[PDB]
Structures are given as C-alpha cells and as structure tokens.
Amino acid sequence: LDPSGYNPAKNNYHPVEDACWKPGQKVPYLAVARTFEKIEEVSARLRMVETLSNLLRSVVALSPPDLLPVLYLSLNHLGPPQQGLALGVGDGVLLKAVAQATGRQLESVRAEAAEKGDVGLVAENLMLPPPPLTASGVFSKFRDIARLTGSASTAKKIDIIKGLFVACRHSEARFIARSLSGRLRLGLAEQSVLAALSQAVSLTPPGQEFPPAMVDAGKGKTAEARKTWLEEQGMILKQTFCEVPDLDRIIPVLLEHGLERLPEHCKLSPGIPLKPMLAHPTRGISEVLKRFEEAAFTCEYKYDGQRAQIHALEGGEVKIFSRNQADNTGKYPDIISRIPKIKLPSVTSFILDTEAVAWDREKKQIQPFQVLTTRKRKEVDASEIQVQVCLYAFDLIYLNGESLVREPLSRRRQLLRENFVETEGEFVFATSLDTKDIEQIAEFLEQSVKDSCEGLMVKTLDVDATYEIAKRSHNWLKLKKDYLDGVGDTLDLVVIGAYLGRGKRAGRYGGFLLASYDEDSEELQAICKLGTGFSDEELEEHHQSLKALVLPSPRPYVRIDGAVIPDHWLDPSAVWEVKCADLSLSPIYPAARGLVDSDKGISLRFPRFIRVREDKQPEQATTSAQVACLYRKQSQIQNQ
DNA sequence: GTCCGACCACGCATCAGC
C-alpha cells in the first residue's frame, strides 16, 4: 500500500504481507531506499544481512524479474565486471546536476558537499508530482548514463540525473546521488549481499506459484539447526560465485534450479573469469612458521607487475583478464601471439594465474612498475607496442577440460611444470623454494629484492592448499620488506597542508600534504599525500592541534607545483614519521626535482603514518638530498 | 579473522572549453 512506511527490519517479517507493492507489479525504488535506511542505521552485519534478505525474499515472491536490478543496485554496480560499463560521472558533474535540479548556485553546492563529505545530504535538502521511481527503471537509467559517450555526452548525462532528482520522493534523493558518486556507504558489500541472497532463496524458495506455499523454510528447525543450514547453503552460493562472479549468469539459473543444484550448471570454464586468490600480509618470519606450523609451504618471489589470468579456450581463443575480472585481451596482442610458444602440443585448454612484469630486452632485466603502466591499454597493434612484458606463472587452475580448483598446490605445480615450457625473458616460472628453516627464508627474502622484487609469497603445499577462495579468501601470505619493523625507508616529513575528509572522516581531515626540506633552495617541497596509518583517536589529536596552525595563504618557502591545493594551508611546524614501500619518479611533485631526473621529482609509494616526531623541528627533517639518495639506493633503480 | 570503507601514487582515456 504505502511504501513510505516500508520496514524490512521488522520482527517476524512476512514476505508477502509486510511488503509494500502488489504481486506482478514492479518493485518501487522507495522500498529499496527505505531498506538502505534500515541498513545504514545499524552496525551489526548480521542485522544488515537480515534486513536486505527481507527485501530479497519479497522480491523473489512478488516480482521475480526485478531480482537482478535489486542486487546490482545494492552492490552499486552496473553489470558483470568484464562488461566494462562505467558511469563516467564525476563529482563536478553530479554537483552540477544537483544545483541545476534544486535551483542553487554551483559555488553554493560545491562548497556545501565539501563540508558535509556526502553529496546525498545536499541533494535531499514546485513541479507536479511525477510518477514514482521504479527499481528496475532507475537501474536502467544508471546503465543509460554509463553508455553515453562522445562530444556533448556529459550534458546528456545531466538531464538523466536531473530526471531522477525531480522524481525522487522522501529519501530517494540521498541514495541516488550516493550511488552516482560511487560512495553508497552502507557498511554492506559483495560478501554480505551474497549471504543475504543465499538466505532469501533458502527461506523463500523461488519458482513457487502464487500463493507462495513456503514463505519461511526455517519454521520447523532448531535455532542451531537453522544457523547451520543457512551457513552450508551460503557456501554453495559463495563458492559458485567465486568461479563465476557474474550475476547475469547465476541469478537466471538460481531462479530455475534452486541453490542446491546451482553448482551443477554454473561451473568454472575458460573464458568466464574467476576471482583470483589473494594474499594476507604477515608481520615477520615467525608469524609465517606459526600460522603455517603443521604444514610444509613453498616460497616464491612476489613480482611487481599486473596480475593476468590467461584463459585458453578450446579452439585457440585466448582471453586475458585482470584481478577484477576485467577484459585485458586488447591490452596484450603481444601475448596472444606468443601462446603456442608456452604450451605443449598436447595442451588444448588452460587457465593460468600469472603476473605481467615489464621487461627490458637489451638489458635483459626487470623494469619498475611505472614502466609497465606506460602501456597503452585499449586495443593496440603489436607493432606500436614499446614496453615489453614477461609472464611469471605461479598457478594452474584449468587444464584440458578438467578443473584443478579442488587439487592441492603441489599437484597444480606439477602439471604446470609438465605441460608448459619456459622461455628466458618471456615465460618463466616464479622462483620458488620449498624450505622450513628460518636461515634460508630470510636469505631468500633478501635475494628477491636483490633480483628486483617486492618480497616473497608463502603458500601451503598440501594442508589447505586448494584454490577454493570461498573458505579462506586470504590463504596465501605476503612478506614484503616494508612490513618488518625496524627496516624500510622511514622519512621524517613536515605537514604543510591538509584536506577535508569525506564519509567516515567527515568533519575531520582525511588527508595531509607532506614536504621534504630542500636545503639549497631553503624551501619545503611537497613530496606526497598521507591519508592512512592514523588511529581514529590520533586523527583527532591531529585535527585539533593542527586547527590552531591554519594559514589563509601558503608560506613563501613552500613549493607544491602540480600538487592538489590543500583545503587548509598550515604553518609548517609538525614533523611526522612516514613509512613507505618505494620511491617513485613523480610527474606532479617537486621534491628533489632535478637531483635525479631533469624534469621530475620524487614521491612515496604506499605512504602511511607511523608516529609524530615532536622533538624534531621542520629544519630537522628528511632533506630532498636524502630523498634523492634513497631513490638511487633502491634495488630496481640500481639494477638499471 | 572477516568485512567494509576511509585514504595513497601513477598514467592512459576521455571531453568541455577554447
């Protein structure tokens, strides 16, 4: 009846009764918006999952076809990752449509949303009432916005955004703007959406003619029996979605065959991307041999490049996907021509887990990550390429029809070495080492950096050595040089500027501008920005103490060049200790400019805050000459 | 430990404005 009072967070929620739309009718967007309200209101994940599941239950029973747009709207996605659909809507475009729709000045709303940290609050705060917004239609308008390209397309995107804002009632304007800005801020993402959908199709099975005979399949169960039944049902959907992270493929099959029979039809196959195996960072060599004590592990290098899933289809078709299931086949014409040189004549199909690293041919050495990012993406010709790549395969998932996900790593490494041939500077296995004692491990870790690598990989060989990422999504372990305490390029830099925070950091500063001391010019040269490493209490100690140091104008001895203008200029007085992974040749920052490259400065890779240095003063800080020394001291730069 | 969302540098790709 009235969707304004729709409460999906009600005890003993009845899917057909407590809903707010008649069967056969389309799901109104206000129902999705009121549920977002009930989800952001709480902080318990088990509470959000149940609230979202209460909507999904009403969807599969009243409007089954609207299930896919509801899931995508909840995920704030536009489709499968390999589709490549992107909104192309910046903040300035969204703020332009907000002030245009509500009749306000651009400078009034641009300064507004900056102080709030959330555009949804500005949009919500004359014309005849338009028809209510539908969930599927709103999702179809998001795709319509993303498909617009070419000249005058930005203008065309603004009319569509304006059309939704003039039709938004109650709370819909808050969440439309949040979705269009890519910051839904629900505390609910892919893992909770999957659990809420697995719970909905189990409690209210789909494919059930009105009247729904089973609205709560957990009625005749003990409390322990229901939590166990919903958990095993959830892992069926989680593992299937891990081999096919595609909702456009799973939901139609799930609607017709149920959750239990879903693996029998949604199976891992070449050409369909799969979610890659991730690695968990660990402190030192002791935490490695502790969590992995009762299991023999291998130790492979960690290469600084781009992860590349090489799918080989029956018939020669080759597709390369990225870590986020994005199509990168047009990125590597140079690879698709070198496929036969890596597989034996008996290999008819495979899925390889490799890492693309920029390779120099004349020097026969590895190039830094910046050189790899200079490749042209898009759809290059093999003649116009310039930055060469060398594959470092470290896993095998699919081979000649059979899938290798349920096999230990020791088995996959055997088939990978037997059915594939190495090529120096083209295809070579990740340098591995099966070792248990700490002496060779610490020596192998230093050998990786000497051979221009980030660190070492730790993976079990038998015990929990499967590729089922649904059980342990971070079963692998990272061991970089910057993780070990007492080692790593630590710098004592000065804060000069600070940026207003957004979302979780709204009302505070979310970032800070850091500078190094150029003694020759007697200037403070901005080196990087810093927005991670602080504790929430430490960020308040910084938000208050630095608030007495705000300057209306930058000091004359400050030099930031093409860096982002800080929202607040600060009196240089605070010296902070900052840990970083690497030193990069910056095209934007002026720190140590001219000391290494004639046209570029130096910035920090992965900078994070460590500790305030109250004893040190701005003059007693890391010099630009010191910064230039650390750059040439780096291994990847020394090997060049 | 899991999950989520704050934030970092860099460089190709795109488009409003000229």
Residue numbers in the entry: 261 to 385, 392 to 906
Authors' own words:
ATP-dependent human DNA ligases, DNA ligase I, IIIα, and IV, share a conserved core architecture consisting of the oligonucleotide binding domain (OBD) and the adenylation (AdD) domains, and catalyze the conserved ligation reaction involving three consecutive chemical steps: the formation of the DNA ligase-adenylate intermediate (LIG-AMP) in step 1, subsequent transfer of AMP moiety to the 5′-PO4 end of the nick (DNA-AMP) in step 2, and final phosphodiester bond formation coupled to AMP release in step 3. Here, we determined X-ray structures of LIG1/3′-RNA-DNA hybrids and captured the ligase during pre- and post-step 3 the ligation reaction.
However, in the post-step 3 structures of LIG1/3′-rA:T and 3′-rG:C, the 3′-OH terminus attacks the 5′-PO4 terminus downstream of the nick DNA and a phosphodiester bond is formed. The overlay of the pre- and post-step 3 structures of 3′-rA:T and 3′-rG:C demonstrated the difference in the position of AMP as well as in the distance between 3′-OH and 5′-PO4 ends of nick, which were measured to be 3.7 versus 1.6 Å (3′-rA:T) and 3.8 versus 1.6 Å (3′-rG:C) in the pre- versus post-step 3 structures. When we compared the density for AMP in the pre- versus post-step 3 structures of 3′-rA:T and 3′-rG:C, the omit Fo-Fc maps at 3σ of the AMP moiety shows good density for almost all the atoms in the AMP in the pre-step 3 structures while only sparse density is observed in the post-step 3 structures. This suggests that the AMP is released which occurs after the formation of a phosphodiester bond between DNA ends. In the post-step 3 structures of 3′-rA:T and 3′-rG:C, E621 residue shifted closer by ∼1 Å toward the 5′-PO4 (+1G) of the nick that is sealed through a phosphodiester bond formation. The sidechain rotation by 24.5° was observed at R573 in the post-step 3 structure of LIG1/3′-rG:C as well. The distance between the amine group of K568 and the ether group of ribose sugar in AMP was calculated to be 2.8 and 1.2 Å in the post-step 3 structures of 3′-rA:T and 3′-rG:C, respectively. There was a shift in K568, R573, K744, and E621 in the post-step 3 structures of 3′-rA:T and 3′-rG:C, which would clash all over with AMP. Because of this, we suggest that E621 may reposition after phosphodiester bond formation to facilitate AMP release. In addition, the amino acids in the LIG1 step 3 structures of 3′-rA:T and 3′-rG:C clash with the AMP, suggesting that the AMP in our structures is mostly released.
